[PDB]
Design a protein around this ligand. Sequence first.
Ligand code: NAG
Lengths: 42, 42, 49
Amino acid sequence: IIRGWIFGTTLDSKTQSLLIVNNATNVVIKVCEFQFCNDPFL
Amino acid sequence: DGYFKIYSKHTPIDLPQGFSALEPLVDLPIGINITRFQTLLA
Amino acid sequence: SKVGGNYNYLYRLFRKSNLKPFERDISTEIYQAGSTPCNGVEGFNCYFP
Ligand SMILES: *[C@@H]1O[C@H](CO)[C@@H](O)[C@H](O)[C@H]1NC(C)=O
């Protein structure tokens, strides 16, 4: 049920954030300038 | 110092008793600023 | 170097606080330098970093 985490200071597109996730097939680590949802899920 | 160090461990069987020490997993050179985090649930 | 000037190399001139070791900052937000609000606009108080 627990899949990963997101780290940062502001979770909008104005700064960089780290995304660690393990979907059904792959674990993906990315450090990009994401725009995140209020309630992100899978 | 711009690194993201992770220590993890798994153990077969409300926080339980015992003593188990986590071993190093990875140290990622992301070089960003972190002050918040959130969990992803499926 | 090129004749007439090469403008492909940039650097940051304004920032609110000092960096930490091995920390990268690739933001592009306008810098406030007079305590007067400036939302994107520039001039007499605010500069492109
Ligand atoms: C990291 O972020 C916090 C809040 O977003 C900020 O106060 C701090 O200055 C940032 N780090 C540095 C080195 O400035």
